[PDB]
């Protein structure tokens, strides 16, 4: 039986400015580096780097919807959004739903968010409002 | 402050599918689906399917190394990755060893793996048969 994500890797075209954006900016701790690759923590999410003569920098647009939303509390997103602002990091989406959540881009262009809330609360606000078709277990 | 990961969105092309895949095959738990998305959830992950046109199948050999490492237990890894086999799940090769894993494809290409381990166990791995050009901090 699978009891959750064991970690999470990303391929990266340039280790040193992902390095800093996910250590620097956004504040995770970084664990180890070498020629190929990095370990950095977020709570007790495990995220690796990984070096790739493959990855292209994709803009949003030549992208699919697959995304990675990092948690944060209501109190800690407004500055957090803002920190994120003042360095130039690009939005791929605005929000339309209720709920907090913000939409950035990595110097790659994997697809990231910020968001507020749970999956209890989420399926709590879906039940007053379905979506179409929608149909709970 | 970043405190984790909130959930994780996968692009899929066809939804039956998918949610097929991640809860008949992998055992997740279905939460709720709708016409063009469903949420599950797998321990502490909370994981999202949403439909995407946009979504391509492209081959292994022609994606980049991003990739989804769920846990399992050294008692089940072995029996798991032997029922994915027989089920027909396609394989995919990653460049370096990073312990007890099994690479395998969903049915858009999404690259997960089942892992044996923690990042604390992969780092002291580390220190005994280190990366090419590898630091600790
Ligand atoms: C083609 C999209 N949809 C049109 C109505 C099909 C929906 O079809 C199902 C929905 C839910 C379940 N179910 O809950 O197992 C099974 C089938
Ligand atoms: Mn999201
Ligand atoms: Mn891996």
Known sequence: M???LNHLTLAVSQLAP??????????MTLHARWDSGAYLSCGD????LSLDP???VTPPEESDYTHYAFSISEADFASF???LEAAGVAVWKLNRSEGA???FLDPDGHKLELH???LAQRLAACREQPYKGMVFF
Do not use: K, N, P
């Open 101 to 103: 959540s913000h939409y």
């Open 81 to 83: 959004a803002a920190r």
């Open 54 to 56: 493959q990855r292209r």
């Open 45 to 48: 999410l495990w995220l690796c």
């Open 2 to 4: 699978l009891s959750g």
């Open 18 to 27: 992902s390095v800093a954006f996910y250590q620097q900016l956004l504040g």
């Open 116 to 118: 507020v809330g749970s």
